[PDB]
Amino acid sequence: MKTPRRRMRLAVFKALFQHEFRRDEDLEQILEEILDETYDKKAKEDARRYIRGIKENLSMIDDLISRYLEKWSLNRLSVVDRNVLRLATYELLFEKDIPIEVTIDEAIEIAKRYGTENSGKFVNGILDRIAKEHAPKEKFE
Q1: Alpha carbon distances (Å) from 139 to 7, 66, 76, 77, 97
Q2: Which fold has domain 1-141?
Q3: After which residues is the chain broken (C to N over 2.5 A)?
């Protein structure tokens, strides 16, 4: 009953999604409502690190994503696409040990989950571009 990476990451995404409608609340507190007995010690630890990392680097993350947007602005994207991009960019830059392909493929899955095939393709395009110019060298192999 190990908690899979996909579920741990989805909890992070759910906290980001919910915060869009609860902007006066701390993203960390929102994550704590989502995390419960169904998540193991490692998944809780990981989700908390992700949420704190995204909160601590939000400006830099948003600014970086925006360098790849033109027709759409980060604020005009849906709550799903904006937060999938934030989550994936954080993971790409800061979670060493996760292959670029895993971050991108899983992020596309979340975008398709709550969006459409077109959402997935859109996300895929932006992330491929961010990864090819910003993936840390530890992920080259």
Answers
A1: 23, 23, 31, 28, 7
A2: N-utilizing Substance Protein B Homolog; Chain A (1.10.940)
A3: none
Resolution in angstrom units: 1.4
Give alpha helix (H) positions in the chain.
Answer: 5-19, 27-34, 41-56, 58-66, 79-94, 100-114, 117-134
- Joined tokens for residue 82: 């904006």
Cα gap 38→82, rounded to integer Å: 27
| 110 close to 36: Cβ distance less than 8 angstroms | no
- What kind of experiment solved this structure? X-ray
The pair of structure tokens assigned to 54 is 């995204």
**Pair of tokens at residue 124:** 């895929």
Sign of the C-alpha dihedral computed for residues 68, 71, 72 and 73 taken in this order: positive
